[PDB]
Amino acid sequence: DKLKVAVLFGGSSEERDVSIASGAQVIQALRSAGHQVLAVDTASGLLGAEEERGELAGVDVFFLALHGGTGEDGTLQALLDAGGFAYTGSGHLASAMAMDKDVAKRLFLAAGVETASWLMAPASEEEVREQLGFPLVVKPNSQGSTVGLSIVHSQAELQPAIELAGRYGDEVMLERFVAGREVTVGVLDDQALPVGEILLGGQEVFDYEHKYQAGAVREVFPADLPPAIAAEAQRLALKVHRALKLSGYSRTDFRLDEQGRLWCLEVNTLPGMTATSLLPQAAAAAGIGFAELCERICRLGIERC
Amino acid sequence: KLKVAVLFGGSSEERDVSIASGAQVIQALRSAGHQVLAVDTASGLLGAEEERRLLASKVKEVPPDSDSLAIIRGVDVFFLALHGGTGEDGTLQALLDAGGFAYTGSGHLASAMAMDKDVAKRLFLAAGVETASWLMAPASEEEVREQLGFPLVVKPNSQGSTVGLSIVHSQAELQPAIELAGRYGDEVMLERFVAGREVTVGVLDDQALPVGEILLGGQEVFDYEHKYQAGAVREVFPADLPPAIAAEAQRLALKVHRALKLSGYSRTDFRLDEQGRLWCLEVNTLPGMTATSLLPQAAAAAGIGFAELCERICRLGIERC
Numbered sequence: 001d002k003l004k005v006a007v008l009f010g011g012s013s014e015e016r017d018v019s020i021a022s023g024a025q026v027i028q029a030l031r032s033a034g035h036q037v038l039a040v041d042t043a044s045g046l047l048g049a050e051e052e053r054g055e056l057a058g059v060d061v062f063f064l065a066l067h068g069g070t071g072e073d074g075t076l077q078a079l080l081d082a083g084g085f086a087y088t089g090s091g092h093l094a095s096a097m098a099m100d101k102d103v104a105k106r107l108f109l110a111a112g113v114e115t116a117s118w119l120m121a122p123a124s125e126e127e128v129r130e131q132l133g134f135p136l137v138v139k140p141n142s143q144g145s146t147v148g149l150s151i152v153h154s155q156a157e158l159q160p161a162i163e164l165a166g167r168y169g170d171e172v173m174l175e176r177f178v179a180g181r182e183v184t185v186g187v188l189d190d191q192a193l194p195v196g197e198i199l200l201g202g203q204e205v206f207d208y209e210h211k212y213q214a215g216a217v218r219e220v221f222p223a224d225l226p227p228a229i230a231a232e233a234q235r236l237a238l239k240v241h242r243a244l245k246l247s248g249y250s251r252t253d254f255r256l257d258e259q260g261r262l263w264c265l266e267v268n269t270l271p272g273m274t275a276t277s278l279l280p281q282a283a284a285a286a287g288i289g290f291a292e293l294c295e296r297i298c299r300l301g302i303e304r305c
Numbered sequence: 306k307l308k309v310a311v312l313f314g315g316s317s318e319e320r321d322v323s324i325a326s327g328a329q330v331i332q333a334l335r336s337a338g339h340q341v342l343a344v345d346t347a348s349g350l351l352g353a354e355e356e357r358r359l360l361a362s363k364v365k366e367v368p369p370d371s372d373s374l375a376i377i378r379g380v381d382v383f384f385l386a387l388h389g390g391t392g393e394d395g396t397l398q399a400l401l402d403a404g405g406f407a408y409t410g411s412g413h414l415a416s417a418m419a420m421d422k423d424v425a426k427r428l429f430l431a432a433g434v435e436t437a438s439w440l441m442a443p444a445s446e447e448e449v450r451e452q453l454g455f456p457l458v459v460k461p462n463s464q465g466s467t468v469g470l471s472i473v474h475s476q477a478e479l480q481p482a483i484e485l486a487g488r489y490g491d492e493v494m495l496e497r498f499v500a501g502r503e504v505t506v507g508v509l510d511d512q513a514l515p516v517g518e519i520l521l522g523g524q525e526v527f528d529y530e531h532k533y534q535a536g537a538v539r540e541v542f543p544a545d546l547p548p549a550i551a552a553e554a555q556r557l558a559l560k561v562h563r564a565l566k567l568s569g570y571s572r573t574d575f576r577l578d579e580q581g582r583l584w585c586l587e588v589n590t591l592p593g594m595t596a597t598s599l600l601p602q603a604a605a606a607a608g609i610g611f612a613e614l615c616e617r618i619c620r621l622g623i624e625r626c
């Protein structure tokens with residue numbers, strides 16, 4: 001039968017605007033399926049009639065429409081664990097691991113999932129030149145939505161990029177740049193969804209502004225890939241999902257180089273659920289509408305907790 | 306002087322060990338001139354009468370049974386004298402993060418990884434630290450014979466104090482050991498048994514402490530009774546090891562401590578086989594501070610008294626948070 005769902009969204013991370021967009025979509029979708037939905041901005045509280053345009057007693061599950069920060073890195077998950085509350089997405093350890101890109105890439109390698117060489121800042125000019133080369137990617141260790149990320153083409157560009165990434169967290173990653181195509185794989189309850197490609201044109205990376213403006217980039221589900229490469233991307237994403245002990249759903253990002261080899265960048269335990277977002281498009285390609293997707297995520301969270 | 310809240314007790318199978326650790330830490334910090342509040346996380350901030358009775362309780366031969374645990378279930382720094390469960394697996398750490406409180410030991414990711422022995426061992430190998438072959442239940446008897454063979458160790462993935470652990474010498478013993486380990490958590494490890502010597506390395510503030518050896522006599526493993534009954538086993542600090550082996554154990558323990566992003570202090574356990582190879586079992590982020598505990602003995606061997614050790618752990622927590 002129908003659920004009472006509290007959709008937690010907003011928060012105080014650099015991905016707050018993305019989270020508000022996700023929360024708005026999920027609230028409408030679950031209401032469309034006849035569930036009772038309570039909208040909670042975790043930076044303010046329970047929204048009234050106008051703001052949407054005690055009561056949480058009897059809530060079956062908290063839908064975590066949050067992105068980044070304490071909402072995605074395990075902190076909120078542990079808070080809800082300690083309160084005995086059911087929630088969607090991955091648990092405390094799994095969420096904390098997937099947000100730490102450094103730790104996650106060590107586990108990718110342990111699972112047989114290819115990933116680009118990297119160093120954590122600070123790194124000397126010698127270490128960078130010997131192990132990484134140019135161009136390279138500087139990114140915060142625990143951000144999302146491409147926040148804080150720079151492409152570094154020469155040694156003189158490195159320090160400003162590290163300082164930029166350092167404004168968004170305590171650790172900074174220097175990663176070998178993988179030239180090629182942009183591929184992403186959603187997982188829903190231990191099943192891979194159709195692979196998607198993001199067509200970047202002349203751009204080096206998939207940045208914040210192109211991730212969340214409608215029509216800024218073309219996104220193709222199922223991607224126009226040789227069947228064996230798409231099957232490999234799905235095989236690897238499931239290995240990542242299982243390796244980090246994720247639950248419910250996830251979305252894994254790959255770079256596909258000009259030689260046909262896939263390189264795993266990261267996995268996201270709370271991927272975007274907006275209109276332009278990648279995971280809903282992969283689900284729709286699999287035949288799963290957005291409302292059904294939201295309900296299934298709810299029930300997977302209930303079963304786990 | 307500081308104002309310290311010592312959190313202890315909890316509702317894990319290591320509750321009695323935690324009470325014993327908290328009692329020592331509270332006593333030592335009060336001797337050093339600090340104001341100390343005692344907090345059993347199973348109830349709350351204790352009054353003097355409930356403090357007096359709780360802290361006098363000694364660790365028993367067996368851990369607190371499930372039925373007993375069912376009934377149980379201006380501060381400068383929170384000293385976490387807890388062991389296991391939510392007190393050590395990152396849950397409480399995240400609680401304290403969210404409240405902006407300073408606490409001792411490792412953060413919430415680091416604590417969660419060290420309690421998950423499976424994940425920790427993957428990171429051991431990533432850091433160049435040897436560790437024994439292992440499988441996670443469910444594993445077919447076919448897989449077990451092919452990968453591990455006998456003897457092997459069955460242990461809960463996320464316990465401590467040797468709770469739920471069995472040595473399996475034959476096929477018939479395997480299923481009962483897995484059922485036992487499953488009464489103490491959701492995940493169960495099967496690990497190749499390493500015959501040899503029992504070696505442990507404390508770390509304090511990114512420095513290794515003198516290596517210790519636990520002399521087990523004829524016992525194959527270091528169990529709950531022998532860990533906490535006084536005089537049950539002889540423990541040697543600094544261990545009587547070839548210097549190159551002790552120095553390698555210390556190098557590896559520091560690699561483990563840094564690999565899992567631990568903070569403050571830790572204690573890493575190894576088995577040393579007859580060929581001189583070290584095999585890393587686990588690292589503990591909230592090691593015991595009881596009167597029979599290993600970390601205080603390593604600290605003492607480095608010239609660090611117990612009260613000073615407690616104070617230094619406090620200040621490392623304040624500086625981190």
Ligand SMILES: Nc1ncnc2c1ncn2[C@@H]1O[C@H](COP(=O)(O)OP(=O)(O)O)[C@@H](O)[C@H]1O
Binds near residue numbers: 139205
């Ligand atoms: N090593 C790399 N090589 C090439 N492009 C990269 C690399 N790392 C990141 N990028 C680009 O930056 C984007 C964001 O990187 P990602 O690692 O997915 O972090 P985020 O969590 O911010 O999405 C990717 O979608 C990709 O376009």
Ligand SMILES: Nc1ncnc2c1ncn2[C@@H]1O[C@H](COP(=O)(O)OP(=O)(O)O)[C@@H](O)[C@H]1O
Binds near residue numbers: 467
């Ligand atoms: N693979 C193994 N080989 C030999 N002895 C083991 C092994 N694993 C555990 N033990 C024994 O069991 C004890 C507890 O195991 P450990 O991995 O340290 O778990 P705990 O977190 O319960 O201390 C060890 O001190 C050791 O005596």
Ligand SMILES: N[C@@H]1CON=C1OP(=O)(O)O
Binds near residue numbers: 143
């Ligand atoms: N974390 C963002 C927001 O929702 N989905 C995301 O994926 P990412 O941009 O991290 O690749």
Ligand SMILES: N[C@@H]1CON=C1OP(=O)(O)O
Binds near residue numbers: 467589
């Ligand atoms: N976890 C226990 C209690 O404090 N220190 C301990 O180490 P372990 O027995 O886990 O090796």
Ligand SMILES: [K+]
Binds near residue numbers: 098266267268269
């Ligand atoms: K991530």
Ligand SMILES: [K+]
Binds near residue numbers: 420421587589
């Ligand atoms: K441990």
Ligand SMILES: [Mg+2]
Binds near residue numbers: 266
């Ligand atoms: Mg991400």
Ligand SMILES: [Mg+2]
Binds near residue numbers: 145253265266
């Ligand atoms: Mg990404």
Ligand SMILES: [Mg+2]
Binds near residue numbers: 465466588
């Ligand atoms: Mg342990």
Ligand SMILES: [Mg+2]
Binds near residue numbers: 466467574
């Ligand atoms: Mg141990």
